[PDB]
Design an enzyme around this catalytic site. Structure first.
Site, PDB file in Angstrom:
ATOM      1  N   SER A 157      11.159  -4.362  43.410  1.00 27.73           N
ATOM      2  CA  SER A 157      10.911  -5.560  42.645  1.00 27.73           C
ATOM      3  C   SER A 157       9.436  -5.888  42.750  1.00 27.73           C
ATOM      4  O   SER A 157       8.803  -5.641  43.784  1.00 27.73           O
ATOM      5  CB  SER A 157      11.779  -6.703  43.204  1.00 27.73           C
ATOM      6  OG  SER A 157      11.526  -7.932  42.536  1.00 27.73           O
ATOM      7  N   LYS A 158       8.880  -6.424  41.673  1.00 24.21           N
ATOM      8  CA  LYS A 158       7.477  -6.771  41.666  1.00 24.21           C
ATOM      9  C   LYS A 158       7.144  -7.789  42.762  1.00 24.21           C
ATOM     10  O   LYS A 158       6.115  -7.673  43.416  1.00 24.21           O
ATOM     11  CB  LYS A 158       7.091  -7.283  40.273  1.00 24.21           C
ATOM     12  CG  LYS A 158       6.561  -8.696  40.223  1.00 24.21           C
ATOM     13  CD  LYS A 158       5.101  -8.750  40.671  1.00 24.21           C
ATOM     14  CE  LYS A 158       4.886  -9.768  41.809  1.00 24.21           C
ATOM     15  NZ  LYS A 158       4.051  -9.240  42.942  1.00 24.21           N
TER      16      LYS A 158
END
Length: 468
Positions: free
Chosen positions: A245-246
Site C-alpha cells: 500500500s502506498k
RNA sequence: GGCCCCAUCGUCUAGCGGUUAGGACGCGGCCCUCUCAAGGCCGAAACGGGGGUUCGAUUCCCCCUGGGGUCACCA
C-alpha cells in the site's frame, strides 16, 4: 511462439508492483526468445493521471527492462494505448451482442446501487429485454452498458499454470459490464481483445486478477478463440502482510530513484520476490535471471517488501557490483542536489573510493562525506569533546605537519606513529582529535587517507581553524 | 460474510519421503583495527495444529486454524 505483456494503468506514480510483473514477463518472454509487449490501460477517463504514462515507461527502462513493442517503441499490432483503439472494443462488444453472449443494460448507477443494496450485486434483470427493444433504446441514443451474458445455469473451468485447474460456478461469475456508458471498455473486455489481437500467449499477472480470470476464459470462449496460458504472481505485501500500500510502504519507483537506490539493485531485489537461484546466490544480473528463470523456482507466498534488505542490497551493489568509476558517476546527481561540488574527477573518485563501504544509498554519500566537499559541515558533540580534549598535543603536532614534505598516506602515518610514540600515547589519542579537527565527525574513513586526500595546504589550513 | 489463493526462523527463502531442516537480511559475539564501516568466523532464530497415507513426512490427501485476495459503468 511466446508473447507476454504488461498492461499498466497511467493512474498514479510508477508502481513497484508494476515492475515486479514486468520483470517476470520480460524474463519469461526472453527466456523463450519470445516477444514482450507494453499495453497502456488508459480507458478510465476518471482515474487517468496525465503524465503518468511517460513515467511508467521511463521507470521500466530505468530498471533495465526493454520491451519489444509499445507506445514509444512502435510495433506491428495496432496502437498500444487502449484509448486509441476504442472503436475496436466497440465492434467486438456489438459482436457478442449480435451473438447472444452479451446484453445491453440501462439501469442508472443509483438503481444499480439499489439493485446491489437489496440483493448482492446486479441481478441481470436487463437480460429480459427484447433484443429489438434494447437495440431500439440504444438507437435512440439511450445510455447503457454492454454486460457479459454469463450462461447462468453452469460452471467454468480455469487453469493457472502455477496452481492448476480451478473450476468455478457461474453463480459466482457476474455479468460484468464490458463496454461502459461512455463507450469505454473494462479490463475484462479490452484485455482479452488486445491480448488476442496482439498475440499474447502467456498472461502473467498479479494474483489480484485470479478470480477475474473465469470471466476472461468465458470471453475467449464467446469470441470463439484460443485462451492463453495464465500465471498469477503473488501480490507484494506491506510489512503487515497486506498487499503493498502506498501509505504502508513506498510503492513509487520515483521514490526509490530519489532515495539513491540503484535500479540494478532494486531490480535484483525484485527478483528475489518469489524467484530464487538454484545455488542460493542472491546477487546476479538481469541476464542471469532471464536465463535461470523457471516457473518451478517461483514461490507462491505473498512476499513482504523489506526496505532493510533492499538497502543492504543497494550497498552491496555499490561496493561489489558497480565499478568505482560507475559509483562516482551516479553519486554526482546527489552531490549537485545537496548543493555540494567536487574539485575534479580524480578528487571525486578517491573521495568515493574511501566512502564506498560507508554508504548504502547514493543519497547517503553527500551526507556522510560532506566535509569532503565543503567547509560548511557539522561538528558532533563527541567530535568537539575529542577535539577540545586533544587540542594541546595537536598544537604539539601542527609544526611537524607544517614541516613534513612527503604528504603521503605512508609518510603521514609514519610521522603520526612517531608522534604518538615520542609522546608516550596510543595512536588513536592523536588520530581521533585530529580526525575530528579535519572532518568534525569521529565516524570517518582512515585518518591517513583523509589527511592525504585533502592535500598539505588544504589539510593544515583547516586544522588551523580547528586549533584557532 | 460467499468464493478463491497461500501457509519453513521476525523477513526473503532452499527442500521434494529419510537432512544436524541450508542460505540471506536483521540481531548478538569475536577477529581485524586510528574511529565508523566493510570483511571473516561464531551464535540465537522456523517447518501452525489434527488426522490420515506410508515402514518413513516439513515433503502426499483431508479437515481445522491463520493470512491474503476478491465480490465496482467511477459515467
Amino acid at each position: 511462439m511466446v508473447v507476454t505483456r504488461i498492461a499498466p494503468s497511467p493512474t498514479g506514480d510508477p508502481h513497484v508492483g508494476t515492475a515486479y510483473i514486468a520483470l517476470f514477463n520480460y524474463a519469461w518472454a526472453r527466456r523463450n526468445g519470445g516477444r514482450f509487449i507494453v499495453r497502456i490501460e488508459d480507458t478510465d477517463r476518471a482515474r487517468y493521471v496525465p503524465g503518468a504514462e511517460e513515467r511508467i515507461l521511463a521507470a521500466l527502462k530505468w530498471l533495465g527492462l526493454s520491451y519489444d513493442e509499445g507506445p514509444d517503441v512502435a510495433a506491428p499490432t495496432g496502437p498500444y494505448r487502449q484509448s486509441e483503439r476504442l472503436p475496436l472494443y466497440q465492434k467486438y462488444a456489438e459482436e457478442l451482442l449480435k451473438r447472444g453472449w452479451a446484453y445491453r443494460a440501462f439501469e442508472t448507477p443509483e438503481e444499480l446501487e439499489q439493485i446491489r443494496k437489496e440483493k448482492g450485486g446486479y441481478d441481470g434483470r436487463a437480460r429480459n429485454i427484447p433484443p429489438e427493444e434494447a437495440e431500439e433504446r440504444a438507437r435512440r441514443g439511450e445510455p447503457h452498458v454492454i454486460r457479459l451474458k454469463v450462461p447462468r445455469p453452469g460452471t467454468t473451468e480455469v487453469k493457472d499454470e502455477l496452481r492448476g485447474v480451478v473450476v468455478y460456478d457461474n453463480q459466482e461469475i457476474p455479468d460484468v459490464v464490458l463496454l461502459k456508458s461512455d463507450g469505454y471498455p473494462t479490463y475484462h473486455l479490452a484485455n482479452v481483445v488486445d491480448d488476442h489481437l496482439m498475440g499474447v500467449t502467456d498472461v502473467i499477472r498479479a494474483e489480484e486478477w485470479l478470480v477475474s480470470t473465469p470471466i476472461h476464459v468465458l470471453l475467449y470462449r464467446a469470441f470463439g478463440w484460443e485462451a492463453p496460458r495464465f500465471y498469477h504472481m503473488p501480490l507484494l505485501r506491506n510489512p503487515d502482510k497486506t498487499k503493498i500500500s502506498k501509505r504502508k510502504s513506498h510503492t513509487s519507483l520515483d521514490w526509490y530513484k530519489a532515495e539513491g537506490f540503484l535500479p540494478e539493485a532494486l531490480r535484483n531485489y525484485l527478483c528475489l520476490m518469489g524467484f530464487s537461484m538454484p545455488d542460493g546466490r542472491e546477487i546476479f544480473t538481469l541476464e542471469e535471471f532471464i536465463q535461470a528463470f523457471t516457473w518451478e523456482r517461483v514461490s507462491l507466498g505473498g512476499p513482504v517488501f523489506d526496505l532493510e534488505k533492499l538497502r543492504w542490497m543497494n550497498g552491496k551493489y555499490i561496493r561489489e557490483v558497480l565499478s568505482l568509476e560507475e559509483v562516482a558517476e551516479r553519486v554526482k546527481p546527489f552531490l549537485r542536489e545537496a548543493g555540494l561540488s567536487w574539485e575534479s574527477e580524480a578528487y571525486l573518485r578517491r573521495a568515493v573510493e574511501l566512502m564506498r563501504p560507508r554508504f548504502d544509498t547514493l543519497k547517503e554519500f553527500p551526507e556522510k562525506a560532506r566535509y569532503l566537499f565543503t567547509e560548511d559541515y557539522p561538528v558532533s558533540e563527541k567530535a568537539q569533546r575529542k577535539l577540545e580534549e586533544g587540542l594541546p598535543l595537536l598544537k604539539e603536532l601542527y609544526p611537524r605537519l607544517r614541516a613534513q614534505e612527503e604528504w603521503t598516506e605512508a609518510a603521514l602515518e609514519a610521522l603520526l606513529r612517531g608522534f604518538a610514540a615520542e609522546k608516550g600515547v596510543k595512536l588513536g589519542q592523536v588520530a581521533q582529535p585530529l580526525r575530528a579537527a579535519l572532518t568534525g565527525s569521529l565516524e570517518t574513513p582512515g585518518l591517513f587517507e583523509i589527511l592525504a586526500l585533502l592535500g598539505k595546504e588544504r589539510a593544515l589550513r583547516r586544522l588551523e581553524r580547528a586549533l584557532a
